[PDB]
């Protein structure tokens, strides 16, 4: 799938919990963890649109009560080709 799901958190620990829950919940792959600055961490997943929806929902529910919690949960079913250049392809 080509849909994109993202979770923004306050701190790395909720971000890692969100990534774990997202990958365990549905058929999605982790494509990047980004340190935004000022304490924000963003985790990104790709997959089928319904799988992405389930994964992001589970990640939000899992990371809400972890650390300083959840900032954003968002799904884009088909990202523009231009936006593909600001998205990490593989996690590192």
């Amino acid at each position: 799938g080509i849909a994109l799901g993202m979770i923004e958190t306050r701190g790395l620990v909720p971000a890692i919990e969100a990534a774990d829950a997202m990958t365990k919940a549905a058929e999605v792959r982790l494509v990047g963890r980004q340190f935004v600055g000022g304490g924000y961490v963003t985790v990104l997943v790709r997959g089928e649109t319904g799988a992405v929806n389930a994964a992001v929902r589970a990640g939000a529910d899992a990371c809400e009560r972890v650390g300083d919690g959840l900032v954003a949960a968002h799904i884009i079913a088909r990202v523009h080709s231009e936006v593909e250049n600001i998205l990490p392809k593989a996690p590192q």
Partner: protein
């Protein structure tokens, strides 16, 4: 009473042995997941929404897996830091001495 560096910083040191409409209104409806995951608009038919008596995937089945225990300095947070009185300009003659626009400072904090 033995004097010296041992009497300093009492109550500050740690580690010491002693220490040890179809769509809901936009304003008052914040979506769980934004974008394509929005539930604001009432979709009829066979959508991917889940009933109340259906279990799994999200909810406690994602948050009960991993045990967890819970425990600002920036430009935005500094917009209301106390500041001294804004400098005034007492100069005369034509020098573009606008007093209504934004604050412009010269060397030493002079108004300019």
């Amino acid at each position: 009473r033995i004097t010296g560096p041992g009497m300093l910083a009492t109550g500050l040191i740690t580690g010491t042995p002693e220490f040890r409409l179809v769509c809901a209104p936009r304003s008052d409806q914040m979506d769980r997941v934004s974008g394509e995951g929005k539930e604001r608009c009432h979709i009829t038919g066979d959508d991917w929404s889940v009933n109340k008596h259906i279990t799994g995937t999200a909810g406690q089945w994602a948050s009960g897996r991993n045990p967890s225990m819970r425990g600002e300095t920036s430009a935005f947070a500094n917009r209301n830091v106390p500041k001294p009185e804004k400098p005034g300009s007492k100069i005369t003659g034509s020098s573009g001495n606008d007093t209504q626009g934004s604050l412009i400072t010269y060397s030493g904090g002079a108004r300019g």
